[PDB]
Amino acid sequence: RIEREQHHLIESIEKSTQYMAKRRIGALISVARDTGMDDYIETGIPLNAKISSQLLINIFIPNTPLHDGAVIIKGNEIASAASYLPLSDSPFLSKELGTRHRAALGISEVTDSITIVVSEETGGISLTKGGELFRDVSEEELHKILLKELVT
Ligand SMILES: Nc1ncnc2c1ncn2[C@@H]1O[C@H](COP(=O)(O)O)[C@@H](O)[C@H]1O
Ligand code: NA
């Protein structure tokens, strides 16, 4: 069932981001939707892998081949790792945030994707959507947002 994959995806993002937030591991996960992100998948290393919290964690371990860039989830697959996303040049984004946030903001400005960031500085979890940034969200807030936006 597609609903079982969607709840598994939400659960996979929740557990992986909690694990990386606790250890201040930077992360950048873009979930494609109606708007295609195929051009950005082509920039990364193709995985075409089943979604799991364990694989998402292993990708973002620092100083590893797959950690430098964005993971893109498409359908029920982790499509790619270490992909480029377009950077926002918006001057409204706080300068205390990192390039991952700028990339999450940039992709959200030109797609309808949902993008999750884990800051390697603070461990806070942020989300971008439609050019907006939800900064340092709680587990409860992250859960409700993913439920509302990823479950059809
Ligand atoms: N255009 C981009 N698209 C996706 N991820 C990026 C991009 N530029 C930088 N990154 C990520 O941000 C990290 C560097 O962050 P910083 O040290 O704040 O510049 C890189 O190692 C990548 O993981
Ligand atoms: Na596969």
UniProtKB/Swiss-Prot annotation:
Catalytic reactions of this protein: 2 ATP = 3',3'-c-di-AMP + 2 diphosphate
Keyword Cell membrane: yes
Localization of this protein: Cell membrane
Cofactor: Co(2+)
Entry keyword Isomerase: no
Taxonomic superkingdom: Bacteria
Residues annotated to bind ATP: D68, L85, G98, T99, R100, H101, S119, E120, E121
An annotated Gene Ontology molecular function: ATP binding
Key words of the record: ATP-binding, Cell membrane, Membrane, Nucleotide-binding, Nucleotidyltransferase, Transferase, Transmembrane, Transmembrane helix
Loss of function: phenotype: Essential, it cannot be deleted.
Domain DAC: 1-139
GO CC terms of this entry: plasma membrane
Main location: membrane
GO BP field: cAMP biosynthetic process
EC number: 2.7.7.85
Membrane protein topology class: Multi-pass membrane protein
Cofactor note: Optimal activity at 0.5-1 mM CoCl(2), also functions with Mn(2+), for a construct missing residues 1-80.
Subunit structure of this chain's protein: Homodimer, required for active site formation.
UniProt record similarity statement: Belongs to the adenylate cyclase family. DacA/CdaA subfamily.
Function in brief: Catalyzes the condensation of 2 ATP molecules into cyclic di-AMP (c-di-AMP). c-di-AMP is a signaling compound secreted into the host's cytosol where it triggers the cytosolic surveillance pathway (CSP), a host pathway of innate immunity characterized by expression of beta interferon (IFN-beta) and coregulated genes. Expression of truncated proteins (missing first 80 or 100 residues) in E.coli leads to c-di-AMP synthesis.
Protein's UniProt name: Diadenylate cyclase
Interval of the full protein contained in this chain: 104 to 255 of 273
